[PDB]
Structure 1
Amino acid sequence: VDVYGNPIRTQQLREPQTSRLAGLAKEFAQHPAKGLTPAKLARILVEAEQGNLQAQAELFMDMEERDAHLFAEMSKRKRAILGLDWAVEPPRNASAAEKADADYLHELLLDLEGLEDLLLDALDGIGHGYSCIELEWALQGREWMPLAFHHRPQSWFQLNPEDQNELRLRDNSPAGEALQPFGWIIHRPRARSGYVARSGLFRVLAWPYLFRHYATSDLAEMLEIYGLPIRLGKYPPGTADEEKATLLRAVTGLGHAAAGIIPETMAIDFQQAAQGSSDPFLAMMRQSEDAISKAVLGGTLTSTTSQSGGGAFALGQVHNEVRHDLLASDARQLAATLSRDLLWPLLVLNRPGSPDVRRAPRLVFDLREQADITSMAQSIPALVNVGLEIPSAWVYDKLGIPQPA
């Protein structure tokens, strides 16, 4: 069975759950970001709270695509995880059989192509609040294998009417369809405590995005109007339609044309077009960008930048507060999700027996922080000459150097 105890039947693993839903694969995103107003955004969020996640997912995708600063921040945050070395470790004080199981799982993950793509797809749940990856199960004789990992759009799911924390497929029915066991890797990182609909970071970031969009569009319009002044022509009674058209064309082309002549009975008045500055717009854009930076990566390095300054402890100063905390949180949540969803089916299908769930191997990301070799290498000799018996295992582990074999 799975970790949650639901019965597992190997018959349903031959075909993906969504195969019998050919309607989903033919859908196109509705792009709800175009022509978006604060009222529309509020309605979208409220409806999403009630189980209509399609519009929210499409809006989040548009928001990711249309904002360069937000996209850069999210990409940097995800690439931070994608570059971490990982390993599979056996449970606490594991036995020989458990160690062998962990070693086999580690070897299987090493030789499993598409792991990086799986991690990238799973990390989308950081912003979207939940990411679902469908599994393709195949048999190369007697051992089950994940053939491929398919990322399904968040717009394909909904909320259970009887449960606000349980996701279901959109199968044209009011209650949707329950997710098949062992058929998905659902990643639901928890930045804030609440239901799945409210758990996305883009829900926090939506309003600054709209503020920045409005400011940028208004600035573009004002830059378009800038330049020549608006000038209005006046004509006396008894001016025919042809003369009216001639005066109109003359006024229209007068800005580009340096000189022109009109009868003394006519008049042209040059009125202010748009007089001001870009200061308000740029102030709003900077405020929104700082808010986005703080919300995504913390207000110590991105928005209120940590500035330059090297040194042996500079790495620690830059990392440990804020950056290390965020990195560790994301890595630990991703590792927990993976150990729950991918490691367990492999252990319970590819190996004999029914090992207890509490003793399953856990995927661990390498969060080791580079320690100053020079300072500590200076420090050891004094301590050892004093008489302290420092274990070599601690040194080898903390320095990153492996133990002799």
Structure 2
Amino acid sequence: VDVYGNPIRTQQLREPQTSRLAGLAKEFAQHPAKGLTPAKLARILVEAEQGNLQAQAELFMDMEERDAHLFAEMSKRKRAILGLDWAVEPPRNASAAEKADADYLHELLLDLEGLEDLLLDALDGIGHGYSCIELEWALQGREWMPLAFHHRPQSWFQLNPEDQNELRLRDNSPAGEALQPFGWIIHRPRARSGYVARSGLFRVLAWPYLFRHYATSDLAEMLEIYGLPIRLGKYPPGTADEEKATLLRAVTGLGHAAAGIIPETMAIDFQQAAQGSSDPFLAMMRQSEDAISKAVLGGTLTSTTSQSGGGAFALGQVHNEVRHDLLASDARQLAATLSRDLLWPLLVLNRPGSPDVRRAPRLVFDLREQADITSMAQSIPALVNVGLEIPSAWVYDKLGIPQPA
């Protein structure tokens, strides 16, 4: 069975759950970001709270695509995880059989192509609040294998009417369809405590995005109007339609044309077009960008930048507060999700027996922080000459150097 105890039947693993839903694969995103107003955004969020996640997912995708600063921040945050070395470790004080199981799982993950793509797809749940990856199960003789990992759009799911924390497929029915066991890797990182609909970071970031969009569009319009002044022509009674058209064309082309002549009975008045500055717009854009930076990566390095300054402890100063905390949180949550969803089916299908769930191997990301070799290498000799018996295992582990074999 799975970790949650639901019965597992190997018959349903031959075909993906969504195969019998050919309607989903033919859908196109509705792009709800175009022509978006604060009222529309509020309605979208409220409806999403009630189980209509399609519009929210499409809006989040548009928001990711249309904002360069937000996209850069999210990409940097995800690439931070994608570059971490990982390993599979056996449970606490594991036995020989458990160690062998962990070693086999580690070897299987090493030789499993598409792991990086799986991690990238799973990390989308950081912003979207939940990411679902469908599994393709195949048999190369007697051992089950994940053939491929398919990322399904968040717009394909909904909320259970009887449960606000349980996701279901959109199968044209009011209650949707329950997710098949062992058929998905659902990643639901928890930045804030609440239901799944409210758990996305883009829900926090939506309003600054709209503020920045409005400011940028208004600035573009004002830059378009800038330049020549608006000038209005006046004509006396008894001016025919042809003369009216001639005066109109003359006024229209007068800005580009340096000189022109009109009868003394006519008049042209040059009125202010748009006089001001870009200061308000740019102030709003900077405020929104700082808010986005703080919300995504913390207000110590991105928005209120940590500035330059090297040194042996500079790495620690830059990392440990804020950056290390965020990195560790994301890595630990991703590792927990993976150990729950991918490691367990492999252990319970590819190996004999029914090992207890509490003793399953856990995937661990390498969060080791580079320690100053020079300072500590200076420090050891004094301590050892004093008489302290420092274990070599601690040194080898903390320095990153492996133990002799």
Give secondary structure in 1 for the equivalent of 2:311: coil
1:399 shift after superposition = 0.0
TM-superposed deviation, 1:345? 0.0
Aligned to 1:368: 368
Which SS does the other structure have where 1:218 is aligned?
helix
Q: CA deviation at 1:16?
A: 0.0
Deviation of 1:236 (Å) = 0.0
For 2:213 and 2:132, the matched residues in 1 are separated by 30
Deviations 1:20-64 (A, max 9, x none): 000000000000000000000000000000000000000000000
> For residues 221 and 207 of structure 2, what CA distance do their matches in structure 1 show?
21
- For 1:68 and 1:384, locate their aligned partners in 2 and report how far apart those are by CA, in whole Å: 54
Task: Write the deviation string for residues 282-303 of structure 1: whole angstroms up to 9, x where unpaired.
Answer: 0000000000000000000000
Pairwise CA RMSD: 0.0
The aligned runs of 1:6-21 (5 Å cut-off) are 6-21=6-21
Alpha-carbon distance between aligned partners in 1 of 2:152 and 2:345, rounded to the nearest angstrom:
20
Q: Which residue of 1 aligns with 2:158?
A: 158
For residue 328 of structure 1, report the CA deviation from its aligned partner: 0.0
Q: CA deviation at 1:222?
A: 0.0
Q: Cα offset for 1:250?
A: 0.0
SS in 2 for 1:149: strand
Please state how far the C-alpha of 1:241 moved relative to its aligned partner. Answer: 0.0
Q: Deviations over 1:197-243 (max 9, x none)?
A: 00000000000000000000000000000000000000000000000
Runs of 4+ in 1 over 6 A off after TM superposition: none
Q: Aligned equivalents of 1:153 and 1:254: distance in 2? A: 54
Cα distance per residue 1:231-278 (max 9 Å; x no partner) = 000000000000000000000000000000000000000000000000
How much does 1:84 deviate? Answer: 0.0
The secondary structure found in structure 2 opposite 1:261 is strand
Identity %: 100
Length, aligned pairs only = 405
| Cα displacement string for residues 340-387 of structure 1 (whole angstroms, at most 9, x for unaligned residues) | 000000000000000000000000000000000000000000000000
> What SS does the corresponding residue of 1:270 show, helix, strand or coil?
strand
Q: CA deviation at 1:67?
A: 0.0
Q: Give the 3-state SS of the residue equivalent to 1:56 in structure 2.
A: helix
TM norm structure 2 = 1.00
Cα shift at 1:402: 0.0
Distance 1:347 1:383 in 2: 46
**Any gaps of 5 or more consecutive residues in structure 2?**
none
> Could you tell me how far apart the structure 2 residues matched to 1:120 and 1:158 are?
22
**Alignment partner of 1:212 is 2:212:** yes
Matched residues in 2 for 1:337 and 1:318: separation?
Answer: 28
- Unpaired segments ≥5 residues, structure 1: none
* TM-fit CA distance, 1:113: 0.0
- In 2, the alpha carbon distance for the partners of 1:220 and 1:358 equals 59
- Displacement after TM superposition at 1:391 (Å): 0.0
1:174 is matched with which residue? 174
